[PDB]
Design a protein around this nucleic acid. Sequence first.
RNA 1: GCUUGAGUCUCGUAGAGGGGGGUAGAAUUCCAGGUGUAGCGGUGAAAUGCGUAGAGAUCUGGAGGAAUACCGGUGGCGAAGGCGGCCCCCUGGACGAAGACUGACGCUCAGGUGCGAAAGCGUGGGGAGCAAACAGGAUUAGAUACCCUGGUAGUCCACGCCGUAAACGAUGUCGACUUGGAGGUUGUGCCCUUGAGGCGUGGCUUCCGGAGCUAACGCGUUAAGUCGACCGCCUGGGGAGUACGGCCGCAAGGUUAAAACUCAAAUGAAUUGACGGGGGCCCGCACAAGCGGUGGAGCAUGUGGUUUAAUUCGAUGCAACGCGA
RNA 2: GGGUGAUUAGCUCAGCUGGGAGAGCACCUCCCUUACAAGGAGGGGGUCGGCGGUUCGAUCCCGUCAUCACCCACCA
Lengths: 135, 116
Amino acid sequence: PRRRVIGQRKILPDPKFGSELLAKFVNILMVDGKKSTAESIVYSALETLAQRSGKSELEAFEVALENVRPTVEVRPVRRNALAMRWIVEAARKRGDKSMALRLANELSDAAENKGTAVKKREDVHRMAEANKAFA
Amino acid sequence: RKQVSDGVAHIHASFNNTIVTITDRQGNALGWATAGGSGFRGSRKSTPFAAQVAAERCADAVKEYGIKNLEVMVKGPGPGRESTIRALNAAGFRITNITDVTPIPHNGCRPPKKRR
RNA sequence: GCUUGAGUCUCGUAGAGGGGGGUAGAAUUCCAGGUGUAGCGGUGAAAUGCGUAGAGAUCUGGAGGAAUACCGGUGGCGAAGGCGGCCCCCUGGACGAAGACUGACGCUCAGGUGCGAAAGCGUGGGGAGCAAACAGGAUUAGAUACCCUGGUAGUCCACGCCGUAAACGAUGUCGACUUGGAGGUUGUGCCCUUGAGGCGUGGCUUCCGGAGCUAACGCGUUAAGUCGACCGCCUGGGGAGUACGGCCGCAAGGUUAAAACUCAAAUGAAUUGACGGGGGCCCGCACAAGCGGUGGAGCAUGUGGUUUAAUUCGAUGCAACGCGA
RNA sequence: GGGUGAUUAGCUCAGCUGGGAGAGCACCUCCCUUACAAGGAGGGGGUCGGCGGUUCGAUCCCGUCAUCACCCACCA
Ligand SMILES: [Mg+2]
Ligand SMILES: [Mg+2]
Ligand SMILES: [Mg+2]
Ligand SMILES: [Mg+2]
Ligand SMILES: [Mg+2]
Ligand SMILES: [Mg+2]
Ligand SMILES: [Mg+2]
Ligand SMILES: [Mg+2]
Ligand SMILES: [Mg+2]
Ligand SMILES: [Mg+2]
């Protein structure tokens, strides 16, 4: 956009938990236009992690988003978009069997939050508070 | 020790580095720090944030010598003129006077004809 | 003979005009300390260099050399080169004020003589900075260079020598004549200085511009307009301001100054484009943020190339390569 | 065959009182570096030169070997 500003044409939120953020997340984890085989893995992983966390549902990943939120590279929309992208592409590298379970193990290590997600965060976050000259 | 209760800060900001040295009015010194003396050798050592964090390390390790107020002496142009007393009043301690004591020859010794 | 062209006197005024002698202050470096400890400095980024033997920084005391901030400015002086701290001695000019004084004494000037930036040269000093040659480190493919680290001659002074340049205003000297505008400097006749100011007349300088002039750019009372006198100089580029001879000199080199030979262009200004690792402003999936791919695996198609009897021809940067099909 | 420091990541090495061994230089892999510089990130091949002796605890000190390396070496 050399000329124009955004209008950010919107979308429809989640069916069950009603989160527009989760709708954006299934848009993220979607490849080739399959919300259904996205959401089966999504809701199965979330229903595993609810039992494996012993807490509520929406705070169970609000924790997992705030703790993987970086600072700069910055605006909160790119923060909570790159956070979810980091969790996906962190779980892509794991040697586990299924996508929901490797996402669950990634969120577990992001719950005891020294996970590969915050490992990916704390290189750009390491450049922050160490290269505070540029403006 | 000695509870000096007054001080003098010489600063010299070059085009590539800044140095800060702490003394009395009488010239005998206590401690010093450079922008090189905080890491980042090379290009990034000439930056005002580096100058103020060099002041952060400079106010450290002279702490127990009993200093409350001080005077400011300034040599050389660059970022050190502007990003040092910000760290010093972040330490909070009141500034008596600020003096620009940049050495000016009256077109005396011949400079190089450099920078092509 | 005359006095308006040049000249003198008296009073003054401004000024980095010139030569000599001396002095002051900031700063760089060096010497000796005291404080204080792990770097200083350097670049686009690094390295050589200095630093635990204590550097850089830092306060003091000293040594020595060079140049004088701010005032300082299209501000002033000199014929030109050029000349800046202050004071003293000697000295040349310009301008103003009304008079008095001689009576064309004036203009130009080849040859002549003299001055003449910087670099260099001979002799004797001094040598702090900066720095040709040189050495090292860098970049690079290469770097006998740009950058860094040093650092000799040189830059200062005394005397002498070569007398060169984009020594420019690329505009020779002198005198006179035809509209204007706005500044800066320095004088003097006046204003209630009764208001730092403003009113005339002189000297000099800088800019915008009228007629005119020039091929155009542009010049524009300080002309490149209108005249007059005198001098130097040019005759296509290139050879060439080279040689040969002369004169000058410590040499380096200067001055005067050809011929043969070769080409039909070389140049000045200006227009329209193009380009610029030239500037300003924009536009595009041009780039950044994404996402999915290719080139690597097997196969389909096509090109190049090879061999074959022929492997029909055409298309070749995008903008040819599942193209003419 | 005589003295002492010494032998420790790939290197020279350095950290010590009988208590939690390494900062820097070298090797191969990304975001960023338009690119090589720089940066962080995480990648490591301590059997601290060996045996035994220790105390509610060894690179830690001692006895010797081995072994790189410093001093002087006789007179007859
Ligand atoms: Mg005079
Ligand atoms: Mg000279
Ligand atoms: Mg000499
Ligand atoms: Mg140099
Ligand atoms: Mg000439
Ligand atoms: Mg004009
Ligand atoms: Mg004419
Ligand atoms: Mg000649
Ligand atoms: Mg032209
Ligand atoms: Mg992109």
